[PDB]
Design a protein around this ligand. Structure first.
Ligand SMILES: [Mg+2]
Lengths: 1319, 351, 156, 150
RNA sequence: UCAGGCGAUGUUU
DNA sequence: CAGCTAGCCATGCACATCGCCTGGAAT
DNA sequence: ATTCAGGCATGGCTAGCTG
């Protein structure tokens, strides 16, 4: 079955893979994030509640009084999106806060002396998000980019090779929290464990270890293990677990039970350990050689002496042995060490330690942190107790905690926001263990450690900063409390909050200017994932491997969409099906797999979880019952790819589209092109300029419907019904019966958006697409937008094209275009510029806006009015005057059109600062807008009342009808009559009270709108009135522009030939564009050729239908013929059948076909050659896809037949007249008397350093001289030069440059003395 | 510099000098009360650090910032770096009398001339036009002159044709690597708005036609014209100074052309006949009674300068291909014949 | 991990292959690259790109073979001492179930299935560095242990 | 088909215990490379001289008139390498590690590509672009230094 | 009219 | 008293273009 | 309406350890 508004033009479809999860709403990221930001929610949990419940309550210095929170509430804007775009304010909202102040007694329990609650104190303003996911700051339309940065947590890195050139890799460990300071751990070639706090100098980590109030004994107990010796009257013999002999070679003979077991100095097998454990004996004698290498653990003291007998972390010697023996100590503690298992790194660090105690350690850290400061007890105490343990300057996230326990093999996933001694100790354990050999490093690029923020999160952070500043202030003031008389408005000052949030939404590395010139360009700019920004890396001072794709981007980041040039890999576009996991990772869908069936249940997966399982590639031939037709299958397990078995896989791809982005899924026959050109193709397609008449691209990809419908430029309906009224302004929809609410039933109204301005100077326009009396269903197109049609997305147009060199004019890539194009206006574009004149008020006199102007004739003046502003519709040209402005002295400063553009004046705006008289014209425009608004809202009320009376009438027919008594009295008041004792009377009263409410509403809205328009709105200080004028140029096409394909072949149109000369075909038609064949094998993009063929087939079916219809036939022929045209292939999805199209819709279907039978092609499942061939055969063209031609000039036949077909082409907005430029003698900069730079500033080019090298290379000298002396620098030079040129005498006079004179002065500024010399 | 609004664009040197002068005046005031010496020590330390900032902000410890976050610029930066005076305003200066536009092909040109658009010209040579105007006596002063050249009346276009006729110009492309990167041409006026440029140079410029941009330049003085003509005119560069191979190598379509024009099948129309001369060869191929390639015995005559710098003729009956004979009518007097009796790939035409 | 032990015939063959690559193969691709460079575009061209790729791939091979030829310990030992199975020897082995195999044991570079294709570092050989005709010998496959028996030996 | 049979034989020998890990690695990669070369020669012979026609006698072959072979043999654009990547399999593809991957791309731009293959080719191209950038930088710096000494 | 931010277009393994 | 010698700073990083945006807080 | 926290390569240098 099909929607009714799809039956208009049913799109033929190739493809095999049955799809199961339709494309989701393409703007989830923006809208869901922001909604999450601002919404009433209990129990905190990521809202304004979070910030507040974090900062509040705020308590005095035990001043028996304290401030706290209750509830927040927004209001509603004073303005709205349209008015706002016109005026310039931000689309903002009020913000009210209910606070409560309380007071206790002095010297009592917490008894409340008195409390008050200020009525929702005002504070600040936060912008909202337009229904299309865009913000509005200052007459513009900005966007915030989701940011991709490193997750909070612990990380272990190698840094292999390059360092120290020693071949011995290193291992470092980092802790990065979400708001605080850094912390590291790392080794050195001398095998010592060092620490650094915040990239500063280095220390031995034992310093902070014992700064956690630990003794050396405890430290050793933590890290190493114990080995014991005791007094067995000789050598104080040992007990040992044979496990500690793992893969070793004893330095002394292993004896037991008087029996030797292993030779003295040999390796030991595990059978030895087995048999000796079966023996279960540990008491053993040892020699002295095995002793000295050990190190004492604890410190022994004696009865009488108790002096420095043994210092912990010290090796052994026979004299020490005798000393401790003669003092009589039973136990002897040592350190079980090794080389391949347990490196005594901590002991070496201890021996390197210069410190002795907690005090000295704190002193050392305090000294290294802030250089040049008096060491002090409390200073160090409070400092180091404020870098890893307090809410003040340090906090992880729940996310941080989750990652941080996960990488430590812990049990739970919820803890505190702070660190712990236990935590740091465990981190160091992990690092040591990694050094030992077990465990592995974890690379960074794996998406299990990147993370995606969004608008909501960043807004929350900045707003938090605001709140902490304001609490600093509140604490400060409240430290000087009063007698109950202050109220919570003096206790608050939102100006810093406003400052912070304005700064963020206005000027930051993320909030940027939306590229709005093409629906696709929007919807692929909003879904952008950026690696830059505060909190991330830089453009060129950033790493390398991050600029690379990783085997886990799959289905979470496009491979093939990114701008080339200075920053690749940093601006990854976000995948199609990608979502945002709760914690904030990139999750993608998959299909669950049971024992032997590809079940129809989706399931979302994260990054890390993906690694453990095994995943089946998409295009795998199943058979109707989940059974894989083979027993082996291509799949991926862990960045791998390999044929696997049958009963092993557990998840299968959702569809095939999921490896690209919307920015590059519109590329038909994509899979047949290389990577490079696919890339450049997506990018160029993003820059398409709209047109004046869109025409439904032929070879499409089925991903157009969503890309258009959801990118909210077209106007989607909301409640399906019957179209009642159409007009280029508005659309009026009557609702169906049962999709209705009881009260305010009425009908829906849509105000379209007529000719107005983009941000790239393009024409955003809308057009109706239905006719009176035509049903429409929920969620459907009603208004086509810029470059849309009937719902589908269209960018350029489709043209007949033929590949063959033709007299040079297509030498390198120069497309050629025949006048048959520039006649029908099928590339004409519309642009709109916007010009601004201002009225400053400078001392020596205010400005004037009069018509009277000195030293100008009636010529320019005629177009002006009697007030000084051009009429609404004159056809001004370059140089004329739009607004008359003069500055007293009186001098001319009027406003003139920039040189070059033609155009027409479509609209004028006037702003006036209050407190100043108005002219005649502003008054007239005021009265115009008043009249129009009044009429508009009056029509609102009238049609709404009309619908409501109609509903009344419809109701009265049921239950108490009076068909004759109803139309006795007029439409005035049909509620004058009565109804029985039924709920229908209740309904009548509902309708009546709604009518009265609408009356009052109309009254109030009228008055309020009048008051809105009447006043003179605020402005930047120091201005009087602004006049704005629009223009509308109509640039057509001309040699120099840039037309492009989609597969990625550029071109610069180069000649416009007359109709005759284009190579025609034997049937008689001309051909319109002639590219260059040699371009195809070079840029390996074989695709556009297949595209051409398939298009040829399309237009074949088209022309066939057109003939069958023009020779008007019985409809049954069309029925059969369309049926055939739609079946034509192997197993597919489409399965349409026109046996159920009412014998009239069919005709309208043919109508909309006669230009072509649009074919679709999913990306990696597209049509194959055989079906193309058979479609062409259904047409009448030759199978080979090539036709003979006939050249126009000679009128004879080319040889070796060539290719023709329709290749949908686009136009880019690098038009020629925005690049042609020239300067003779214009302005001059002020510091260094040189010509300016750029075009808008009427300047000249730049004669580059390397060019000076070139000119030196040739012997040319005089050219160089006057190239950098007469035409640039010497003031006297160019004056003389000009005066001489005007009279034939070509001759320069060099003089000295002036920038050099400046160089002299700036060096002389210093202690230096530089001079010229004797002549 | 004043900005739009009751403010002023803050510079850096201003702020720095102002800081120094504040600190100096404070210290001067302090040497009257004879305050305790720790104060004056802190004072002198501030002043030393400030003068340090003024001379080189960024060589002591943490550099002083300015408005928002960044080290305000000091004299050391005025001279240093990729943006001081040297590499920005003394080795390459912006220059008047110029312009820029987009390029296209236009193969109807002899390789010592290049297109140019009217509007660009009439904006460039404004002085010359003024001069020739008041020479031919059409306006008294410069005022009416400029008014005429803006209104764009009739006679100006003829005047412009007369003043461009033999006045070379320079074309430049952006990444200028080797001294080919700037060549000369003579203009020929075109309509439209995009420079037309001969094909056989788009290899030396390393410039495709995918939307690149080129800059013009106009010599002013007379020595300059003669330089541009006797040294930089395009005819006088047929060899890259890197190495003696030619640089006028025909590039990418013309080669396919000559290729398909000279080759041989085994059997096509008109095979097995004899032709008195390349003339009637071309005549056959136009009339359409003989294929474009079919092996034929023909007569040809060739010249050779084996004498003391003197040309001598000899003729014979070669065996060749009709198209190849057609190519023969272009070779100048002096070559041998075997140079064009094979496939003619790219290396062949190069040598 | 490796063993510089190589047989002299393969040594010569490898040296000859080196000479072949460095004399009559490199220069042709060289000429192709020198040609393709004279074209205008380089980022809009792929012929230069893929021909350069060919150069990289052949360079890697020549580097590897060079380091090898530097570090090749040659033992062109005769059948002088025979009786065990230590190196460069033909070996028949049979299963207790019917599976038979014939092979010669050589160094790492001589394994391309043609005549003598088994490397010493393989567990098979590692279990056979010296044996006697008519003896059991077991190995540890990833699917468990195995067993065979020797049949005959002929050095050369 | 025969290539797949061979890798199957080698996999059998591995799980039978005659080779090591990197041993299997190199064995497989070599036999695929050999197959690649065979395919290349096959296509080149099937194009360059494929035309065979009558002479007014029976038959005699000659150099062909296939458009792509002309556009290559002339010297205009593209060569044996590109016509390879349009007809035969497009060889092997390294990965960012540099470790060359162990399954060739048995497809070609005329027929289609399943996803993984296109993905890997993306690897290659992106690394190429990044190197273009940095290399440009160093080249410019070298040129400047040289011109300031001579 | 100067300084910065951002984005974009070219040449560029 | 001399020869390293490892560890810590200075300085360097292509060219050309176009468009948009914003330039002190407290008293 | 005045005023005060992801680079690399290289070279040069300085404490600091063996004879
Ligand atoms: Mg280009």
């Amino acid at each position: 079955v099909y929607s009714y508004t799809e039956k208009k033009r049913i799109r033929k479809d190739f493809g095999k893979r049955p799809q199961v999860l339709d494309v989701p709403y393409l703007l989830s990221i923006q809208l869901d994030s922001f909604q999450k930001f601002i919404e009433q929610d209990p129990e905190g949990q990521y809202g304004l509640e979070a910030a507040f419940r974090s900062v509040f309550p705020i308590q005095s210095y035990s001043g028996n009084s304290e401030l706290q929170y209750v509830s927040y509430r927004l209001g509603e804007p004073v303005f709205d999106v349209q008015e706002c775009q016109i005026r310039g304010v931000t689309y903002s909202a009020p913000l009210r806060v209910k606070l409560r102040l309380v007071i206790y007694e002095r010297e009592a329990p917490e008894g409340t002396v008195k409390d008050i609650k200020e009525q929702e104190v005002y504070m600040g303003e936060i912008p909202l998000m337009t229904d299309n996911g865009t913000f509005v700051i200052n007459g513009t339309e900005r966007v915030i980019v989701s940011q991709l940065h490193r997750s909070p947590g612990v990380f272990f890195d190698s840094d292999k090779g390059k360092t120290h050139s020693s071949g011995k890799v290193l291992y470092n460990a980092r802790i990065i929290p979400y708001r605080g300071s850094w912390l590291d751990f790392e080794f050195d070639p001398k095998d010592n464990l060092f620490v650094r706090i915040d990239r500063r100098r280095k220390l031995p980590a034992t310093i902070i270890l014992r700064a956690l109030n630990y003794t050396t004994e405890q430290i050793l107990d933590l890290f190493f293990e114990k080995v014991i010796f005791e007094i067995r009257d000789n050598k104080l013999q040992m007990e040992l677990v044979p496990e500690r002999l793992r893969g070793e070679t004893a330095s002394f003979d292993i004896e037991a039970n008087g029996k030797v077991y292993v030779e003295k100095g040999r390796r030991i097998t595990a059978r030895h350990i087995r048999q000796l454990e079966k023996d279960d004996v540990k008491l053993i004698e040892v020699p002295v050689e095995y002793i000295a290498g050990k190190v004492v653990a604890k410190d022994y003291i004696d009865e009488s002496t108790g002096e420095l007998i043994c210092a912990a972390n010290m090796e052994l010697s026979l004299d020490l042995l005798a000393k401790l023996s003669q003092s009589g100590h039973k136990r002897i503690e040592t350190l079980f060490t090794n080389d391949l298992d347990h490196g005594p790194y901590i002991s070496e660090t201890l021996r390197v330690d210069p410190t002795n105690d907690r005090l000295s350690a704190l002193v050392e850290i305090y000294r290294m942190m802030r250089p040049g400061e008096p060491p002090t007890r409390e200073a160090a105490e409070s400092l180091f107790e404020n870098l890893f343990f307090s809410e003040d300057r340090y906090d992880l996230s729940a996310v941080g905690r989750m990652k941080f326990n996960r990488s430590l093999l812990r049990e739970e996933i919820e803890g505190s926001g702070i660190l712990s001694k236990d935590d740091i100790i465990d981190v160091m354990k992990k690092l040591i263990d990694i050094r030992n050999g077990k465990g592995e490093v974890d690379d960074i690029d794996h998406l299990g450690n990147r993370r995606i923020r969004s608008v909501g999160e960043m807004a929350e952070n900045q707003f938090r900063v605001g709140l902490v500043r304001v609490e600093r202030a509140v604490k400060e003031r409240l430290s000087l409390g009063d007698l109950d008389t202050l109220m919570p408005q003096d206790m608050i000052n939102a100006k810093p909050i406003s400052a912070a949030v304005k700064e963020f939404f206005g000027s930051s590395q993320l909030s940027q200017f939306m590229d709005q010139n093409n629906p696709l360009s929007e919807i692929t700019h909003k879904r952008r994932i950026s690696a830059l920004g505060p909190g991330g890396l830089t453009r060129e001072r950033a790493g390398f491997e991050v600029r690379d794709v990783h085997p886990t981007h799959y289905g979470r980041v496009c491979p093939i969409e990114t701008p080339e040039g200075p920053n690749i890999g940093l601006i990854n576009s976000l995948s199609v099906y990608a979502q945002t996991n709760e914690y904030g990772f990139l999750e993608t869908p998959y299909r669950k797999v049971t024992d032997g069936v590809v079940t129809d249940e989706i399931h979302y997966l994260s990054a890390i979880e993906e690694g453990n399982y095994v995943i089946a590639q998409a295009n795998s031939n199943l058979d109707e019952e989940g059974h894989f037709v083979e027993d082996l299958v291509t799949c991926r397990s862990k960045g791998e790819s390999s044929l696997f078995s049958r009963d092993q896989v557990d998840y299968m791809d959702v569809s095939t589209q999921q490896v690209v982005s919307v920015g590059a899924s519109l590329i038909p026959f994509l899979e047949h092109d290389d990577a490079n050109r696919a890339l450049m193709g997506a990018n160029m397609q993003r820059q398409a300029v709209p047109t004046l008449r869109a025409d439904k691209p032929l070879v499409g990809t089925g991903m157009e419907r969503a890309v258009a419908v959801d990118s909210g430029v077209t106007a989607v309906a909301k409640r399906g019904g019957v179209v009642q009224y159409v007009d280029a302004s508005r659309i009026v929809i009557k609702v169906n019966e049962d999709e209705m609410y009881p009260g305010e039933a009425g009908i829906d109204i849509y105000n379209l958006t007529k000719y107005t301005r983009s941000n790239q100077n393009t024409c955003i326009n809308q057009m109706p697409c239905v006719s009176l009396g035509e049903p429409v269903e929920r969620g459907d197109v009603l208004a086509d937008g810029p470059s849309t049609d009937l719902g589908e997305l269209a960018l350029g147009q489709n043209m007949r094209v033929a590949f063959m060199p033709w007299n040079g004019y297509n030498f390198e890539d120069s497309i050629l275009v025949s006048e048959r194009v520039v006649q029908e206006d099928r590339f004409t574009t519309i642009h709109i510029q916007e010009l601004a004149c201002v009225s400053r008020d400078t001392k020596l006199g205010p400005e004037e806006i009069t018509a009277d102007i000195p030293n100008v004739g009636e010529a320019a003046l005629s177009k002006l009015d009697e007030s000084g502003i051009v009429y609404i519709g004159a056809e001004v040209t370059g140089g004329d005057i739009l607004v008359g402005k003069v500055t007293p002295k009186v001098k001319d400063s009027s406003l003139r059109v920039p040189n070059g553009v033609s155009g027409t004046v479509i609209d004028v705006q006037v702003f006036t600062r209050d407190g100043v008289e108005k002219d005649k014209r502003a008054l007239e425009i005021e009265e115009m807008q008043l009249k129009q608004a009044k009429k508009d809202l009056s029509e609102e009320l009238q049609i709404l009342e009309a619908g409501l009376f109609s509903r009344i009438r419809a109701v009265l027919v049921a239950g108490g009808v009076e068909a004759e008594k109803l139309d006795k009295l007029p439409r005035d008041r049909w509620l004058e009559l009565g109804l029985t004792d039924e709920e229908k009377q209740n309904q009548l009263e509902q309708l009546a009270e709604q009518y009265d409410e609408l009356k009052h509403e109309f009254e109030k809205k009228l008055e309020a709108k009048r008051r809105k328009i009447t006043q003179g709105d605020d402005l930047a200080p120091g201005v009087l009135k602004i006049v704005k004028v629009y223009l509308a140029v109509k640039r057509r096409i001309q040699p120099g522009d840039k037309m492009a394909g989609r597969h990625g072949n550029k071109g610069v149109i180069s000649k416009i030939n007359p109709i005759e000369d284009m190579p025609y075909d034997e049937n008689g038609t001309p051909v319109d564009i002639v590219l260059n064949p040699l371009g195809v094998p070079s840029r390996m993009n074989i695709g556009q050729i297949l595209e051409t063929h398939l298009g040829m087939a399309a237009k074949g079916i088209g022309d066939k239908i057109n003939a069958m219809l023009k020779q008007q036939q019985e409809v049954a022929k069309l029925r059969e013929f369309i049926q055939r045209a739609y079946d034509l292939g192997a197993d597919v999805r489409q399965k349409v059948d026109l046996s159920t199209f009412s014998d009239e819709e069919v005709m309208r279907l043919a109508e909309n076909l006669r230009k072509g039978m649009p074919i679709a092609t999913p990306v990696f499942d597209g049509a194959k050659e055989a079906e193309i061939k058979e479609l062409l055969k259904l047409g009448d063209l030759p199978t080979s896809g090539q036709i003979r031609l006939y050249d126009g000039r000679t009128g004879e036949q080319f040889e070796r037949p060539v290719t023709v077909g329709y290749m949908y082409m686009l136009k880019l907005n690098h038009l020629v007249d925005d690049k042609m430029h020239a300067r003779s003698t214009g302005s001059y900069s002020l510091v260094t008397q040189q010509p300016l730079g750029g075009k808008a500033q009427f300047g000249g080019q730049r004669f580059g350093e390397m060019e000076v090298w070139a000119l030196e290379a040739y012997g040319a000298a005089y050219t160089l001289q006057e190239m950098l002396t007469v035409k640039s620098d010497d003031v006297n030079g160019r004056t003389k030069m000009y005066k001489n040129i005007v009279d034939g005498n070509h001759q320069m006079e060099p003089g000295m440059p002036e920038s050099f004179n400046v160089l002299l002065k700036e060096i002389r500024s210093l202690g230096i003395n530089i001079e010229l010399e004797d002549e | 510099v004043p900005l739009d609004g009751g403010r002023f664009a803050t510079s850096d040197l201003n702020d720095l000098y102002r800081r120094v002068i504040n600190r100096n005046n404070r210290l001067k005031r302090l040497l009257d009360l004879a305050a305790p010496d720790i104060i004056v020590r802190n004072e002198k330390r501030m002043l030393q650090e400030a003068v340090d900032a003024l001379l080189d902000n960024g060589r002591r410890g943490r550099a002083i910032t300015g408005s928002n976050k960044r080290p305000l610029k000091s004299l050391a930066d005025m001279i240093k770096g990729k943006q001081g005076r040297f590499r920005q305003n003394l080795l390459g200066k912006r220059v008047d009398y110029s312009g820029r536009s987009v390029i296209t092909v236009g193969p109807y040109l002899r390789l010592h001339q290049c297109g140019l658009p009217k509007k660009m010209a009439l904006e460039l040579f404004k002085p010359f036009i003024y001069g020739k105007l008041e020479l031919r006596g059409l306006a008294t002063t410069i005022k009416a002159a400029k008014k005429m050249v803006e209104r764009e009346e009739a006679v100006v276009w003829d005047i412009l044709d007369e003043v461009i006729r033999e006045h070379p110009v320079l074309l430049n492309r952006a990444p200028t690597l080797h001294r080919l990167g700037i060549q000369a041409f003579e203009p020929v006026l075109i309509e439209g708005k995009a420079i037309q440029l001969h094909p056989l140079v788009c290899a030396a410029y390393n410039a495709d036609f995918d939307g690149d941009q080129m800059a013009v330049h106009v010599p002013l003085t007379l020595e300059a014209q003669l330089e541009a003509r006797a040294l930089m005119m395009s005819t006088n560069n047929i060899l890259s100074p890197a190495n003696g191979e030619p640089i006028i190598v025909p590039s990418q379509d013309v080669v396919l052309g000559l290729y398909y024009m000279t080759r041989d099948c085994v059997n096509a129309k008109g095979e097995g006949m004899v032709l008195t001369g390349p003339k009637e060869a071309e005549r056959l191929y136009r009339s359409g009674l003989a294929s474009l390639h079919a092996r034929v015995k023909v007569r040809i005559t060739e010249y050779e300068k084996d004498a003391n710098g003197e040309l001598v003729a000899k003729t014979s009956l070669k065996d060749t291909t009709v198209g190849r004979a057609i190519l023969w009518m272009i070779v100048p007097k002096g070559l041998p014949y075997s140079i064009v009796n094979q496939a003619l790939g790219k290396k062949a035409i190069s040598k | 991990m490796k063993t510089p032990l190589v047989t002299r015939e393969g040594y010569e063959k490898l040296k000859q292959e080196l000479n072949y690559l460095w004399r009559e193969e490199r220069p042709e691709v060289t000429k192709k690259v020198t040609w393709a460079a004279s074209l205008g575009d380089r980022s809009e061209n792929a012929d230069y790109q893929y021909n350069k790729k060919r150069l990289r791939e052949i360079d890697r091979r020549v580097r590897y073979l060079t380091k090898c030829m530097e570090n090749l310990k040659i033992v062109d030992y005769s059948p002088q001492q025979e009786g065990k199975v230590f190196f460069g020897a033909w070996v028949e082995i049979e299963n207790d179930d019917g599976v038979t195999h014939r092979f010669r044991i050589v160094g790492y570079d001589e394994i391309f299935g043609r005549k003598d294709y088994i490397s010493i570092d393989s567990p098979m050989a590692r279990a056979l560095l010296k044996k006697e005709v008519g003896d059991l010998a077991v190995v540890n496959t990833p699917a468990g242990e195995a067993s065979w028996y020797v049949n005959a030996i002929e050095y050369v | 088909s025969e290539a797949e049979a061979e890798v199957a034989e080698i996999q059998e020998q591995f799980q039978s215990g005659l080779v090591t890990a990197g041993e299997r690695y190199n064995k497989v990669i070599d036999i695929w490379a050999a197959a690649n070369d065979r395919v290349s020669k096959a296509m080149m012979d099937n194009l360059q001289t494929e035309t065979v026609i009558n002479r007014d006698g029976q038959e005699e072959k000659q150099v062909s008139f296939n458009s792509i072979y002309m556009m290559a043999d002339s010297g205009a654009r593209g060569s044996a390498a590109q016509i390879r990547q349009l007809a035969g399999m497009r060889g092997l593809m390294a990965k960012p590690d540099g470790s060359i991957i162990e399954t060739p791309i048995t497809a070609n731009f005329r027929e289609g590509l399943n996803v993984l293959q296109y993905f890997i080719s993306t690897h290659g191209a992106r690394k190429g672009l990044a190197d273009t950038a940095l290399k440009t930088a160093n080249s410019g710096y070298l040129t400047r230094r040289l011109v300031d000494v001579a």
